[PDB]
Amino acid sequence: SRKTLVVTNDFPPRIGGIQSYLRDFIATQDPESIVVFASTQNAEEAHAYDKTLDYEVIRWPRSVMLPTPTTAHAMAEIIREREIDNVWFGAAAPLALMAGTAKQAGASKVIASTHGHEVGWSMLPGSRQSLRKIGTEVDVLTYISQYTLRRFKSAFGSHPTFEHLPSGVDVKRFTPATPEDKSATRKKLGFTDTTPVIACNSRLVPRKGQDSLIKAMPQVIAARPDAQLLIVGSGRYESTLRRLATDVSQNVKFLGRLEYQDMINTLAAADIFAMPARTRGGGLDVEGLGIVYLEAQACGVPVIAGTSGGAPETVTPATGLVVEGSDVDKLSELLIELLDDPIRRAAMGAAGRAHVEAEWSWEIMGERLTNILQSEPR
């Protein structure tokens, strides 16, 4: 078995996107074949977290791990002491600038994972040159969507092999609701078995299209007067969303940031999941992939996704629909059409569940990572 050193500034107990990504990917591998080299934000909290793991974490006694001679030296000595075959930079920019040292230390394969930030790095002359330097020294560059790949591929260059490695979804936690649980969840919310329920789980920011959803509601409500739009999450755009929803107040619920299981129960009890993501910020405010769409499909719920970035890549014609959020007439039409067809909804949700089990689970994605880490270098 090939042994992997994960080099990262982004590791639990700190909460975040890359932290969750690495935690869950590492858990899919043989713990004996994994070593982590991570920065330390709070010493006692890090020690307490590492104590719970079945694999080794070597803590760098700095609040931020940066590409410096001292960090590179420490990485190099771990590579040799633990007989490391693969060096995996959990986030490419800027730590994968130490990839040269990793090969010097005797590693036979260097992997670096990109996420969202590298897209913006391809827009500036200096940051683009850094991306090229990473590309020239990295054997495998992973990406979350075909969209992000298109945005930064030319910057990295042709030296590395490019591999699709997005986050998976937990198909045991995100699972279709039993009739009992679905009925009870609705009653908890003050609804019934007959209530039309549209769920939107996402941070409350303009690009997620909660505003687009709210603007589509008047037509939805006219057709189905008891239809409820559930806005689940928190963010700075909340006050604007509430103002937008003023004339549809009886049919729009701001539930705030729900507890993890409560969010899942609410999601699984919905008739439709909708999040019409749009690209903003001059092309830089973009949906990299959209794990919420995979979570919905995992719960057996029909999806309406937006046109932004990698969002359309999460669904198939069998599982979901892609729409431009600002198209009020089409969005409301799609919502009414689906709400009025429970058979189509049942078929779409079933297809959603099958889709993620076949292509998006942590079991499937874990296998993808195993293939990268266990294959002989080219």
Tab-separated table of N, CA and C in Angstrom, residues 176 182 186 192-199 220 224 226-227 267-274 296-297 299-304 317-321 333-354:
chain	number	residue	atom	x	y	z
A	176	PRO	N	-33.854	9.365	1.989
A	176	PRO	CA	-35.291	9.645	1.886
A	176	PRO	C	-36.026	9.387	3.200
A	182	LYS	N	-41.698	12.025	7.573
A	182	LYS	CA	-42.117	13.108	6.681
A	182	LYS	C	-43.414	13.766	7.165
A	186	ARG	N	-43.642	17.754	8.861
A	186	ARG	CA	-44.584	18.749	8.348
A	186	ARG	C	-45.480	19.311	9.452
A	192	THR	N	-49.333	20.213	6.815
A	192	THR	CA	-49.971	18.898	6.732
A	192	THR	C	-49.366	18.055	5.603
A	193	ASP	N	-49.939	16.875	5.375
A	193	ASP	CA	-49.523	15.999	4.277
A	193	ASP	C	-49.783	16.628	2.904
A	194	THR	N	-50.708	17.586	2.852
A	194	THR	CA	-51.133	18.185	1.585
A	194	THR	C	-50.422	19.497	1.231
A	195	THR	N	-49.721	20.087	2.200
A	195	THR	CA	-49.016	21.359	1.993
A	195	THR	C	-47.938	21.248	0.909
A	196	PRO	N	-48.007	22.114	-0.127
A	196	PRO	CA	-46.931	22.187	-1.112
A	196	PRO	C	-45.720	22.871	-0.482
A	197	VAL	N	-44.588	22.175	-0.463
A	197	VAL	CA	-43.404	22.660	0.238
A	197	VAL	C	-42.196	22.741	-0.694
A	198	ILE	N	-41.664	23.953	-0.834
A	198	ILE	CA	-40.436	24.206	-1.578
A	198	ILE	C	-39.350	24.580	-0.576
A	199	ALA	N	-38.257	23.824	-0.583
A	199	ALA	CA	-37.158	24.068	0.348
A	199	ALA	C	-35.944	24.669	-0.351
A	220	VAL	N	-46.838	31.299	-8.097
A	220	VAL	CA	-46.959	29.996	-7.433
A	220	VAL	C	-48.144	29.999	-6.464
A	224	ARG	N	-51.410	27.731	-6.306
A	224	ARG	CA	-51.462	26.862	-5.132
A	224	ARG	C	-51.363	27.714	-3.857
A	226	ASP	N	-51.733	27.556	-0.715
A	226	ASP	CA	-51.105	27.080	0.523
A	226	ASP	C	-49.623	26.697	0.362
A	227	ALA	N	-49.042	27.016	-0.796
A	227	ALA	CA	-47.636	26.708	-1.080
A	227	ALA	C	-46.694	27.466	-0.151
A	267	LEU	N	-35.620	19.094	4.768
A	267	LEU	CA	-35.272	18.845	3.370
A	267	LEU	C	-36.017	17.622	2.825
A	268	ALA	N	-35.930	16.506	3.548
A	268	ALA	CA	-36.532	15.241	3.118
A	268	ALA	C	-38.064	15.282	3.044
A	269	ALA	N	-38.674	16.204	3.787
A	269	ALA	CA	-40.131	16.340	3.826
A	269	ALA	C	-40.685	17.265	2.731
A	270	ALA	N	-39.795	17.980	2.048
A	270	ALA	CA	-40.187	18.918	0.991
A	270	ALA	C	-40.623	18.214	-0.294
A	271	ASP	N	-41.467	18.892	-1.065
A	271	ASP	CA	-41.884	18.405	-2.375
A	271	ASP	C	-40.838	18.729	-3.446
A	272	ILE	N	-40.229	19.908	-3.335
A	272	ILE	CA	-39.211	20.366	-4.282
A	272	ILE	C	-38.078	21.050	-3.520
A	273	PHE	N	-36.839	20.789	-3.937
A	273	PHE	CA	-35.700	21.605	-3.524
A	273	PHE	C	-35.344	22.547	-4.667
A	274	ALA	N	-35.254	23.836	-4.358
A	274	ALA	CA	-34.929	24.841	-5.362
A	274	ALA	C	-33.855	25.796	-4.856
A	296	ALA	N	-30.112	17.129	-1.554
A	296	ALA	CA	-31.530	17.037	-1.896
A	296	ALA	C	-31.831	15.744	-2.645
A	297	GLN	N	-31.021	15.454	-3.661
A	297	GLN	CA	-31.148	14.216	-4.431
A	297	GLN	C	-30.971	12.987	-3.546
A	299	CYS	N	-31.801	12.842	-0.490
A	299	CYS	CA	-33.049	12.754	0.281
A	299	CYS	C	-34.266	12.384	-0.585
A	300	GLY	N	-34.024	12.113	-1.866
A	300	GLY	CA	-35.079	11.716	-2.799
A	300	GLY	C	-36.037	12.840	-3.156
A	301	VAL	N	-35.505	14.056	-3.255
A	301	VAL	CA	-36.305	15.250	-3.523
A	301	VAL	C	-35.918	15.841	-4.886
A	302	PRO	N	-36.919	16.113	-5.758
A	302	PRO	CA	-36.683	16.748	-7.062
A	302	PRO	C	-35.937	18.076	-6.921
A	303	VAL	N	-35.009	18.345	-7.834
A	303	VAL	CA	-34.160	19.530	-7.728
A	303	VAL	C	-34.400	20.537	-8.850
A	304	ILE	N	-34.506	21.809	-8.480
A	304	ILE	CA	-34.357	22.895	-9.438
A	304	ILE	C	-33.037	23.598	-9.112
A	317	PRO	N	-31.232	15.166	-16.500
A	317	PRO	CA	-32.627	15.392	-16.905
A	317	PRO	C	-33.647	14.536	-16.140
A	318	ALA	N	-33.202	13.408	-15.586
A	318	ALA	CA	-34.077	12.544	-14.791
A	318	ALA	C	-34.277	13.028	-13.351
A	319	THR	N	-33.328	13.802	-12.830
A	319	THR	CA	-33.303	14.107	-11.395
A	319	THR	C	-33.657	15.552	-11.045
A	320	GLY	N	-33.475	16.452	-12.006
A	320	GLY	CA	-33.613	17.875	-11.739
A	320	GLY	C	-33.745	18.732	-12.978
A	321	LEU	N	-34.023	20.013	-12.756
A	321	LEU	CA	-34.152	20.985	-13.830
A	321	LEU	C	-33.189	22.138	-13.598
A	333	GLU	N	-43.416	28.793	-13.394
A	333	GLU	CA	-44.028	27.760	-14.239
A	333	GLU	C	-43.513	26.362	-13.889
A	334	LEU	N	-42.189	26.233	-13.790
A	334	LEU	CA	-41.537	24.994	-13.358
A	334	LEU	C	-42.000	24.534	-11.977
A	335	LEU	N	-42.102	25.471	-11.038
A	335	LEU	CA	-42.554	25.154	-9.681
A	335	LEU	C	-44.003	24.647	-9.646
A	336	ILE	N	-44.910	25.364	-10.307
A	336	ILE	CA	-46.323	24.968	-10.378
A	336	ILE	C	-46.493	23.619	-11.091
A	337	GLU	N	-45.814	23.462	-12.227
A	337	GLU	CA	-45.848	22.221	-13.012
A	337	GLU	C	-45.449	21.000	-12.173
A	338	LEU	N	-44.356	21.126	-11.423
A	338	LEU	CA	-43.880	20.042	-10.562
A	338	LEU	C	-44.785	19.782	-9.362
A	339	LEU	N	-45.232	20.851	-8.701
A	339	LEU	CA	-46.173	20.735	-7.582
A	339	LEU	C	-47.496	20.077	-7.991
A	340	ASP	N	-47.900	20.286	-9.245
A	340	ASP	CA	-49.152	19.733	-9.780
A	340	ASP	C	-49.020	18.294	-10.302
A	341	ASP	N	-47.798	17.757	-10.301
A	341	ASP	CA	-47.526	16.407	-10.817
A	341	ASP	C	-46.747	15.573	-9.789
A	342	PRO	N	-47.467	14.949	-8.831
A	342	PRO	CA	-46.823	14.151	-7.784
A	342	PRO	C	-46.150	12.877	-8.304
A	343	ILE	N	-46.577	12.396	-9.471
A	343	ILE	CA	-45.980	11.205	-10.079
A	343	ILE	C	-44.601	11.524	-10.648
A	344	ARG	N	-44.516	12.629	-11.386
A	344	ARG	CA	-43.248	13.126	-11.903
A	344	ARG	C	-42.272	13.410	-10.760
A	345	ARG	N	-42.770	14.028	-9.689
A	345	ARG	CA	-41.953	14.307	-8.504
A	345	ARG	C	-41.397	13.029	-7.879
A	346	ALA	N	-42.263	12.031	-7.694
A	346	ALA	CA	-41.847	10.733	-7.163
A	346	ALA	C	-40.762	10.090	-8.032
A	347	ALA	N	-40.937	10.158	-9.351
A	347	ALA	CA	-39.974	9.601	-10.305
A	347	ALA	C	-38.636	10.342	-10.290
A	348	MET	N	-38.695	11.672	-10.237
A	348	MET	CA	-37.495	12.505	-10.185
A	348	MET	C	-36.692	12.277	-8.907
A	349	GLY	N	-37.387	12.261	-7.772
A	349	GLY	CA	-36.753	12.020	-6.479
A	349	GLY	C	-36.133	10.640	-6.362
A	350	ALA	N	-36.838	9.626	-6.861
A	350	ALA	CA	-36.292	8.269	-6.932
A	350	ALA	C	-35.017	8.263	-7.772
A	351	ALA	N	-35.068	8.944	-8.918
A	351	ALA	CA	-33.919	9.048	-9.815
A	351	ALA	C	-32.769	9.814	-9.161
A	352	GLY	N	-33.104	10.843	-8.384
A	352	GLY	CA	-32.110	11.609	-7.628
A	352	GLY	C	-31.334	10.744	-6.650
A	353	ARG	N	-32.061	9.929	-5.888
A	353	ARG	CA	-31.465	9.004	-4.924
A	353	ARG	C	-30.551	7.981	-5.602
A	354	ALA	N	-31.032	7.385	-6.692
A	354	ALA	CA	-30.248	6.426	-7.469
A	354	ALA	C	-28.987	7.070	-8.050
